[PDB]
Symmetry: D2
C-alpha cells in the first residue's frame, strides 16, 4: 500500500451556498451524480451532506440521506462518509442521528469548538444572493461550530459502537491535542484518519508553515498510528494537496471545500477536482488508492457492513 | 528600550480554584497584596480578576474591582490590566462592564471561541475540593470560552473608545489569524500586545515547536507592529518564559497561570514567580522593564488616565 | 508572470557516471540532443557540463563546450547555464574558464566548501563499473568540493564583469548565510536565483522539514529579492519539485541530479523528467515558464548577448 | 538525572586571538587557572586547546597539553575534553596525536569540511593586532576546516580504541546527517554527545529557527540516543544556552566561543560565563550537573581511566 494516495471528495457540504455557484450540488440526484462521478474519477472516499431541494439550505435529518446513500452504493464501491456537522443550534445527539441510523464506515468528526465566518465575502456575493437564508448566514458574525469535550466523547462512544470510524477534522493545532486526549484514553483506536483543514476563517491558515506545523504535530502525537489527509480550503486546495502527496499524505478535494478551478473560473464538477489531484499524484509517480485499498489503509469495516 | 523585558503578573484568574492551593489569592486584600508584591519584584503589568470572598468563586462584576484597583494604584505605578473573561453563560456586554467603567490602560481580549477543560485533573484534586462550585466546574466537559467575531469586534470598538488597549490572548494559530482580520480592518492599531498562551487543555500545547510556530506566525502576520509575550501554563511557565526572553519577547507569570514552583512544591506568592523570571532575564544579560518603559513599548495612555 | 514556474534541466553533470545508467548523456551530441529535447518539453534553463567522449569522465575545459553551446542555441531559445564546478584539485581560476570565455547568461556557483560522497553505493555498483576512473571516484572517502570565501568572491567579480548571473547552489543553511554575506557587500545584485539542493551525501537531507528550513531561511535573509528553485537529488526529485511549485517556487530536474524515473526504473531521457515536472505544475493550475519569462524573472542579459 | 544540565566550558580555543581580548588565556597556567575556575563555577566538562606561550598562536602538539591536563585533574574532577582541530594544512593523523596519546574521556570531533572566516572584523581590529600571525589569519579568505568522511572515520576508529568518546561538533544540518551515516554503520555508539554550533561565519546562523531546526533534525535522526548541547558563538551565547536549557538540552560557554559578557563588555573570565549560564539554569528550576552526572549522561569511562 505504500505510494497509494487516498482522494476524498467532499461533494457539497454546508459552508458554500447555491448562489455562490450554479455547480454546487443541491438535489439528491445532483449529489449522487456528483459522488458517482467523483468516485469514477478516482475518489475512494465520498464525504456527504444533504440539502433541502427547495432552497438549497442544509438538511441534516436522517431521511435527507435516504435518496443519497443507497443510490451511490448501488453504483459505486466507494467508502461513504456521513457528516456529523449541523447548525450551531442543533444538539450533538441530533447531529449524529444520520450516522447513528445508517452506520456508515466513516463519519466526520470536528475536534473542537471554533468560530467560523464568511462575512468578509459579503461585498463580492451580496448582490447575487437569491435566498434570505443565505443573506442571514453570510452576514452572521456570531457563528460557532460547537464540539465540546463532552460532545466529542459522545460521538466517539455512540457512533463507534456501530463500527463507524472517523474522519477527524482538525482545524488547528489544538484539535490535534484534543484528539490526543481521547486517543490516550482509548476512546478511539488507530489508525486515525486525521484530516487537517487549512484556510478557513476561524481555523489555521494555509501558509506552508501551517501545513508543516500540523504535520509535525500529528507525527509527534500519533507516530505511525495515523493516516494524514489535507483539506486546503478555496484556492489553496491543489497547492496543499500537492504538499501532502509529496510528503506521504492523502488528499481531500470537492466543491464542499473549493468552488474554484483557476483564475476566476468556477469548477463545474467534483470529478474535475479529483482529476486535477490525480494528475498531481500520478505526476509524482504515485497511484490513487482504490476503495479496497483505502479500506485497508483506514481499517474500515466494509461497504456491505452498513445500514443502506 | 531594546533589551528590556516586560513581566506581566496574572495574580489569581478564574481557572484555578482555592482548593487547589492555599496560596491562590481570594479576598480583595489578598489580591492587592499579591499585585503590589509582584510589582515590587519587577512586574510592570498586573493582570487582574476578582473573586467572591465567601467561596472564592469568580466575580466579574464592576464593583468587585472597587476594593482592588485604586488600592493597587495608590501603592504602585504598575499598569493595571482588567480581564474581559467570564462565565461561559455571561454575555460579552456584561463581561466588559468592569473595563468599560474603569477605563484601564489594558484589558485582556481572548481572540477566539474555544473548548477548555480541567476534568483530567479530577483524580488528583477531587478529594480535596471544599466547595460544590469547584466540583461542578472541574467535572464539566462542556466548557466553552465564547469569543465570536462579533463579540471581539464589540470589545474592540467599545473598550477602544475609552483609550484602553488590549492584551490579545491567542491560544492557537487561528487566534493570530483572527487578530489579523481585525488589524487589517483597522479596528485595532499597533503596536499589538500579543500574549501567546501555551499548554491549556483546549489550546495549543507547550512543545518548543508550538512556541516557534506561534512566534513565526505572528512575525509573518504583524511584522514589527507587535510586542510578543508568552504565557506558559502550569509547569511550562519558566521554560516558555526563557524561550521568549532569549528570542526578544516578553514574559507572563502568575498564580492565575501556574500554581507550582518546583517538583511538587506550590508557589507561595506571585512575587516568587516574578523573581524567577527576573533571574532568567538578568542571567541573559537583559533588564526587566519598568512600568514607564512598558507604557512606551505598548503605547499605553498612562496610569493617571483611568477611572480609579 | 504570476503562476509561471521555471523548469531547469541539468542534463549530465559530473556526479553520476556512465556505468550507473546507459541513458546518462556522454558525447557532445548526446548532451545537445538531451538539452534540446528537455527545452522542447518545457525546460527554460539548461544546466550544462561536458564529458570526455572516450571514457565519459568529466571535462571542464573551455573547448569541451564548443560543440555544445552554439548547437543548442541554434535549435532552442533556452537559457544556457554553464557549470563552474570541477575536480577537487582544479583551481577556481581554471574552473571558471569556460564561463569566462563564453560569457553565458547564467553560470552555476556552489556557495560553500563541503564533503561529498558516493562510496556507500560501491558495494552494489562495483561489479558493473567499466572504467577505473569510476572505481577511483566512487571509492573516494576524501572528496571535497572547495569553494572558499575568496573563491566565491573571485567567481562573482570575474564572471559578473561579463554580464553572467548565477544559479547560486546552496546545499545547506550555511550556504544561504554565505550568500547573504556577499549580497550585503553588493558583490551580487538581486534578484538572486537560489537553487537549494537536497539529499546529497555531504549536504542537507531531503526531508520536508529540510525543504521548509531552506525556504524560511532564504525568505528571511533575502525577502522578495530572490527566486527560489529546488533540486531534490535522486528519487526525491519530484516530491521536492511538487513542494516548491505548490509554494511559489521553481523546479530543477535532469539526469545530472537523478538517474531515476518512477517505481525503480531508470529514466531514459531528461525530457521525461521535464514532462513529469510539467504534469505536476499543470495539475496545480500553474504554467511552465518560457525562456523569455525566465529571463525576465531572473533578470538575465538575453540569449543574443553571449559569446557563442 | 532529570533536570540536570551539563555546562561545558571551552576555555581558549584557536579561533579568537590574544589581541582581541587581554582575558583570552594563553599560557599553560592561564589555561589551567581558567579551567579550574570554570569547573568550580559549575562546568562539568572542560574543552581544551593549547597555545604557544610566546605569541599566543595555536599549539596542537602532544606536549603542549602536558602542563595542562594533569594539573587540572589534580585540582578538579571535571571531564577533560581534548580538541582534534588543527591548522588547515595539518593532517588528521597529526591533529589527533594529543587525544591519541592522552586517551581522554572526551575529544572534540568536527563533523564536516567547511569554510570559516573572520575577515569582516579586519577593518575594526587591524590596528590593534600585535602579531603578524593574527594579521595573516584574520585576513585569510581561504580558510577551510577539513574533516572528510575518511578523516572522521579515522578519528572514530583510532580514538575510539582508547575509550575516548566524542563531542560531535555539528555546525549545520549536513553535519548531523554525516553523523547519522557513521552511527548507522556502528562506528560510534550512543548516547551521542551532539554539540550544535550556531553563528560562525561558514556555519549555520544563530536565529531561533536555526536552533529549532538543528534540534528537530537531531531528534528525528537519533531519537533518544543522544544528548543535545548548544554552542552559541559570540553574543548569541546566553540566548542560545537559555533556549537549550528550557528545551531539555545542555549548554556550552567559554572564551573560546564568545569573548563577551553583557552590554558590550568583554568577559574577564570563563567562570563569569559559567555563572551566567548557571543563573539561567537555576532560574528555570533546573540544576547544574556535576562531573559524575555528566559522566553517566554521556556514558564516559571515568577520570581515573585516562593517560594523565
Ligand atoms: O462540513 C462538516 O462536516 C464540517 C462541520 C463544521 C464545518 N464543516
Ligand atoms: O483569564 C482570562 O482573562 C482568560 C479568559 C478565558 C480563559 N482565561
Ligand atoms: O555540478 C555542479 O555544478 C556542482 C558542483 C559541485 C557538485 N555539483
Ligand atoms: O575548536 C575546535 O575544536 C573546532 C575545530 C574547528 C573550529 N573549532
Ligand atoms: Zn463536511
Ligand atoms: Zn485572566
Ligand atoms: Zn552541475
Ligand atoms: Zn575547540
Amino acid at each position: 500500500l505504500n505510494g497509494k494516495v487516498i482522494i476524498t471528495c467532499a461533494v457539497t457540504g454546508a459552508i458554500h451556498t447555491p448562489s455562490m455557484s450554479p455547480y454546487l450540488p443541491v438535489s439528491a440526484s445532483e449529489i449522487t451524480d456528483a459522488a458517482i462521478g467523483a468516485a469514477e474519477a478516482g475518489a475512494a472516499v465520498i464525504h456527504l451532506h444533504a440539502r433541502h431541494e427547495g432552497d438549497g439550505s442544509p438538511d441534516q435529518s436522517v431521511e435527507a440521506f435516504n435518496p443519497i446513500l443507497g443510490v451511490i452504493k448501488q453504483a459505486s464501491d466507494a467508502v461513504l462518509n456521513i457528516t456529523t456537522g449541523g447548525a450551531p443550534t442543533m444538539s450533538i445527539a441530533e447531529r449524529i442521528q444520520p450516522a447513528q441510523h445508517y452506520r456508515p464506515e466513516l463519519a466526520s468528526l470536528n475536534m473542537g469548538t471554533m468560530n467560523f465566518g464568511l462575512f468578509p465575502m459579503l461585498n463580492r456575493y451580496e448582490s447575487q444572493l437569491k435566498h434570505q437564508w443565505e443573506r442571514n448566514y453570510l452576514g452572521n458574525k456570531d457563528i460557532i461550530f460547537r464540539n465540546t469535550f463532552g460532545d466529542v466523547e459522545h460521538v466517539m462512544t455512540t457512533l463507534g459502537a456501530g463500527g463507524t470510524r472517523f474522519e477527524f477534522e482538525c482545524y488547528d493545532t489544538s484539535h490535534l491535542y484534543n484528539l490526543k486526549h481521547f486517543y490516550d484514553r482509548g476512546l478511539v483506536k488507530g489508525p486515525l484518519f486525521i484530516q487537517t483543514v487549512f484556510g478557513l476563517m476561524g481555523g489555521i491558515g494555509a501558509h506552508p508553515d501551517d501545513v508543516l506545523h500540523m504535520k509535525r504535530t500529528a507525527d509527534r502525537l500519533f507516530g505511525q498510528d495515523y493516516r494524514w489527509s489535507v483539506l486546503g480550503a478555496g484556492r489553496n486546495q491543489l497547492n496543499i494537496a500537492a504538499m501532502s502527496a509529496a510528503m506521504g499524505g492523502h488528499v481531500r478535494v470537492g466543491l464542499e471545500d473549493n468552488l474554484w478551478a483557476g483564475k476566476g473560473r468556477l469548477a463545474e464538477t467534483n470529478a474535475q477536482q479529483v482529476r486535477a489531484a490525480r494528475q498531481i499524484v500520478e505526476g509524482l509517480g504515485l497511484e490513487v488508492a482504490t476503495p479496497a485499498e483505502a479500506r485497508e489503509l483506514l481499517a474500515l469495516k466494509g461497504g456491505d457492513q452498513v445500514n443502506f
